[model samples]
Target: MKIFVKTLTGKTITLEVEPSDTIENVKAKIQDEEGIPPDQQRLIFAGKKLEDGRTLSDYSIQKESTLHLVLRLRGG
Candidate 1:
């Protein structure tokens, strides 16, 4: 399966993944490609927030599924 990731900066990328792949794994790829750390990334799919431990199948993610990424902003 493949997924579409859209970043906060309006950048988008298409990534290949398996139904068995964990969201954590996808986040790792996103961190590498988008420079957004996994911890600071919030992924929204199907109007619900995606969890790291969950699989694509769990979330019913199919080919061409779009994931909206929101980078967490920290302020002190």
Candidate 2:
């Protein structure tokens, strides 16, 4: 199944991820595509927070599901 992601910057992208994929795995793909650090992403799906160690199935993810990704900005 594919996951749809919307970033805070208004950029949107669809990704291919399996139900067994971890949130970190998804982040890695996003990072590769967007140049956003994996650790800087916060994902919310169906109003539930997505955890790094949790599998997509853990969140009952499905095809064409949309998730909001908020980038955590940091400074020195």
Candidate 3:
């Protein structure tokens, strides 16, 4: 399936993924395509934050779902 990741700046990134793929896996793909590190990525779907160990199916994510990607602030 394909999913869209939208940034706060209104840029959207389309990614090919499987429902069984973990959130971390998707973040890694974004890293590969956008050069953003997984640790700095926070993916949200349906108003819930996605966890690294959780699969897309676990969140009831379907094909062509659009996820919101928020970048974590660097440093405390």
- Tell me how many clashing residue pairs each candidate has: 0, 0, 0
For candidate 1, what is the lDDT?
Answer: 0.79
User: Global lDDT of each model?
Assistant: 0.79, 0.80, 0.84
How should the candidates be ordered by TM-score, best one leading? Answer: 3, 2, 1
Instruction: Tell me which of candidates 1 and 3 scores higher on TM-score.
Output: 3
lDDT at position 51, candidate 3: 77
Provide C-alpha RMSD values for all models, in order. Answer: 1.9, 1.8, 1.9
lDDT of 3 at 39: 90
lDDT digits (tens) for residues 1-76 of candidate 1: 5678887778886778676778898788787776778887788886889889889779897667788887776333
lDDT of 3 by residue, 1-76 (tens): 6889897657898999878888889989788887667897788997999879889999998768888888895356
lDDT of 2 by residue, 1-76 (tens): 6778887779787888777888898888778787768887888887888879888888998667787787777344
The best-first sequence of candidates by lDDT reads: 3, 2, 1
Instruction: Give the Å shift of residue 61 in candidate 3.
Output: 0.8
After superposing candidate 3 on the true structure, give the runs of residues whose Cα lies further than 4 Å from its correct spot: 74-76
